[PDB]
Amino acid sequence: QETQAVEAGEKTVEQFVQALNKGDYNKAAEMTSKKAANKSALSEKEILDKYQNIYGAADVKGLQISNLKVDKKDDSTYSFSYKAKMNTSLGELKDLSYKGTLDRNDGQTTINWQPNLVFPEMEGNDKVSLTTQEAARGNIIDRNGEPLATTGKLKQLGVVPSKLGDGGEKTANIKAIASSFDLTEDAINQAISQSWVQPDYFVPLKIIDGATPELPAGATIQEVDGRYYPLGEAAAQLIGYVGDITAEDIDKNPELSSNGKIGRSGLEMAFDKDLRGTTGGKLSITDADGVEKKVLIEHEVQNGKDIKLTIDAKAQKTAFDSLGGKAGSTVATTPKTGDLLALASSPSYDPNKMTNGISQEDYKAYEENPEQPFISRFATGYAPGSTFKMITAAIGLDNGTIDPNEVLTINGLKWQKDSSWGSYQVTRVSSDVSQVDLKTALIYSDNIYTAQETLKMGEKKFRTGLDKFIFGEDLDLPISMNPAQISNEDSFNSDILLADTGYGQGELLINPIQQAAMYSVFANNGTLVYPKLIADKETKDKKNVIGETAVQTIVPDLREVVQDVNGTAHSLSALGIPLAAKTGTAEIKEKQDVKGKENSFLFAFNPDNQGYMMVSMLENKEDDDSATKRASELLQYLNQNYQ
Numbered sequence: 001q002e003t004q005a006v007e008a009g010e011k012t013v014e015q016f017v018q019a020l021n022k023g024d025y026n027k028a029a030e031m032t033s034k035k036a037a038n039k040s041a042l043s044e045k046e047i048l049d050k051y052q053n054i055y056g057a058a059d060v061k062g063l064q065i066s067n068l069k070v071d072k073k074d075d076s077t078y079s080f081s082y083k084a085k086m087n088t089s090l091g092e093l094k095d096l097s098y099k100g101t102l103d104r105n106d107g108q109t110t111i112n113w114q115p116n117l118v119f120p121e122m123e124g125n126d127k128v129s130l131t132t133q134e135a136a137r138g139n140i141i142d143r144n145g146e147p148l149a150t151t152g153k154l155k156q157l158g159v160v161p162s163k164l165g166d167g168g169e170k171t172a173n174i175k176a177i178a179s180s181f182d183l184t185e186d187a188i189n190q191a192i193s194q195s196w197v198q199p200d201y202f203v204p205l206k207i208i209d210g211a212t213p214e215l216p217a218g219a220t221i222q223e224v225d226g227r228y229y230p231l232g233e234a235a236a237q238l239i240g241y242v243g244d245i246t247a248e249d250i251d252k253n254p255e256l257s258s259n260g261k262i263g264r265s266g267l268e269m270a271f272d273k274d275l276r277g278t279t280g281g282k283l284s285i286t287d288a289d290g291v292e293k294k295v296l297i298e299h300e301v302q303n304g305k306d307i308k309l310t311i312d313a314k315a316q317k318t319a320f321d322s323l324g325g326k327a328g329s330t331v332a333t334t335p336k337t338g339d340l341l342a343l344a345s346s347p348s349y350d351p352n353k354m355t356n357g358i359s360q361e362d363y364k365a366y367e368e369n370p371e372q373p374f375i376s377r378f379a380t381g382y383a384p385g386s387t388f389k390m391i392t393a394a395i396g397l398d399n400g401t402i403d404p405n406e407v408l409t410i411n412g413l414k415w416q417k418d419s420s421w422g423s424y425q426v427t428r429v430s431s432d433v434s435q436v437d438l439k440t441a442l443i444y445s446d447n448i449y450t451a452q453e454t455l456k457m458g459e460k461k462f463r464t465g466l467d468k469f470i471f472g473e474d475l476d477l478p479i480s481m482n483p484a485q486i487s488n489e490d491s492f493n494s495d496i497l498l499a500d501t502g503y504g505q506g507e508l509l510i511n512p513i514q515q516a517a518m519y520s521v522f523a524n525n526g527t528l529v530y531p532k533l534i535a536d537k538e539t540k541d542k543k544n545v546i547g548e549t550a551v552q553t554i555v556p557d558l559r560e561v562v563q564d565v566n567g568t569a570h571s572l573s574a575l576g577i578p579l580a581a582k583t584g585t586a587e588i589k590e591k592q593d594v595k596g597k598e599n600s601f602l603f604a605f606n607p608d609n610q611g612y613m614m615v616s617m618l619e620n621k622e623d624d625d626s627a628t629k630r631a632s633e634l635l636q637y638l639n640q641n642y643q
Contacts, residue, residue, distance in 0.1 A: 059254035135277030138304030240266020329377035335523035381509035387584030388504025395465030454502025602627035
């Protein structure tokens, strides 16, 4: 029964470590011997309190042991020893050498508990102290060092209920404050009326940006430090925001500062580790006289690193403002390198109001806006619309299905292969041109031409051309997204779905960033250049996506999308800048709608220098609205600064 008792001790030690690992300090204490010399040093409840105070002070998480040995030191007392490691608010404590003894009384093996089982070299009434220094959060900057996310001094407006009034003069000063700072009068009274307020306390109200006006009776400006976003809502979905760190955050990662901020969405969350730095300080053991006897962990505070983006701050603000608060998104790149210059999504939310404590109704307004400003539309999969005719055309030119000079005879406004298609009709906007070749189809955006050429091409050849793109690939970007898909399954099993896919509808799902990746072939002679968001990242590409001949056939036609008097983007010819473009619509029918909606698209790049490329979309567009109707300002800027 000697080998069985060694095994019972090994079991006891492992159960002890498990109860500590799980934070159940009570169960760990109920596995100890009685309080006595050469037994347990403290009682059960005293062991619970010792672990709860000490392990809680250092935020000890996850105890793991190794090299466990249980031998035999006595007839009723067995000696054990093991290595161990744990995680604390100052990092990982490794190579901890624990030792002790067990007790075999009756058929129960208990642990002769000692303070050396809290931390290795603790005796009797030793204490533990933890000193920490907060790490300052890093900055997020654009391609020219402009601040996108930075921490700075903010002016916090607040009122003291004492210096206010008693009744009549109180209500007067309140309304004066509510008018002098664009605040609700009921909000000021609701603020000073919460349970935490004392009559002399400073009750904060608002973070005032700009210049402080006149301060009426009771109003006082107080400087505080906090995160600040200069572009505001214009970059909210991309940058994100930070919020107060909670107890649940600490239970998940103790190396966070329980007093600091954590990124909740966007890049602030994607690069939270790099931006937050690492806490500095010292975890030490002292004797009962406060004399330090062992330093367990000690390292200096390392501030957070900066993150430099390919983003252009002026392009980001121009791209967002051009959407007029309507639902949509705009992506701008330098297509030869993939530098993402702008990632705008509209409508948007205020990230400064978000991180400076937002009202609960103001949050609900964001959450119940039917346009849903919280959506990162540049990372959300959409059907690319009839813009996708470029890709289907290039595939058709590569496999010899499409002769650029062959003229299909197309009569009327709607077409279908036969009657089996039922209510599905491929539609075009004009019946004035019945002799349609490739150049005419691109200039006028003729879906009937594309649907017929797609059908003639066939599913196998269509997919062989599509598989050369980035469908199914996870882009190497710090933005949450799903890979693009051609359709739901590997086979269309439907001529309708095949034709619908031909001009960018069907079950296609491609987010705006993935779209700009695919469309970059027309600025790199058939080579796909993967988009890039981090400035120092190396350019990556994929070669022979479409044929070099196909690019040389299509780009001249895309020039005429702008230059021709009846080209779908002819209003951009006014710019007087070299433009190759392609408009598009995607027909959407969602359950809540009786009538169908459509998304408006624009693709455009500089065909002379290949310096920029843009893909804008309007989601559920209103009547008399389009993406190309809003692209003049951004196109002028991109042409001037990116050649």
